[PDB]
Design a protein around this ligand. Structure first.
Ligand SMILES: CCOC(=O)Nc1cc(-c2ccc(C)c(NS(C)(=O)=O)c2)nn2c(C)nnc12
Length: 127
């Protein structure tokens, strides 16, 4: 049964906050990366069935994607900005683990990550 269940995006008993940093993560970081020409393979979980990659989820045990991140930000899933930043980093790292240097998907990930790092550098102070 080739795809795992997707990451959780809803959990009513998990404590949540709305912080100005989490707002920036949705309105600046996510928005910018989402509309990028290279965003599309990252906008939902890797579909190992569709791609015929039966080894994907043998290799990647902590999957993450921007579709998941978008839903987490829109539905106020997080306690802090660092949880969300960790999700972006997991997404990029997984890509580098599974694939090889110079593969198209890696080039795409690198371009998104450069942008991500540019925006995270301007993360607002926690008010
Ligand atoms: C040895 C071949 O390796 C790969 O094909 N690698 C990867 C491929 C794709 C990828 C391509 C095309 C499409 C249509 C999709 N769609 S989706 C999100 O529904 O699965 C994803 N994403 N990807 C991500 C992230 N990380 N690695 C890969």
């Amino acid at each position: 049964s080739m795809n795992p269940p997707p990451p959780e995006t809803s959990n009513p008993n998990k404590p949540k906050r709305q912080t100005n940093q989490l707002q920036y993560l949705l309105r600046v970081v996510l928005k910018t990366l989402w509309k990028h020409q290279f965003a599309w393979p990252f906008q939902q979980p890797v579909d190992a069935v569709k791609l015929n990659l039966p080894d994907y989820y043998k290799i990647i045990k902590t999957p993450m994607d921007m579709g998941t991140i978008k839903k987490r930000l829109e539905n106020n899933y997080y306690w802090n900005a660092q949880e969300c930043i960790q999700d972006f980093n997991t997404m990029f790292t997984n890509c580098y683990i599974y694939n090889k240097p110079g593969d198209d998907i890696v080039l795409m990930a690198e371009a998104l990550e450069k942008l991500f790092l540019q925006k995270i550098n301007e993360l607002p102070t926690e008010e």
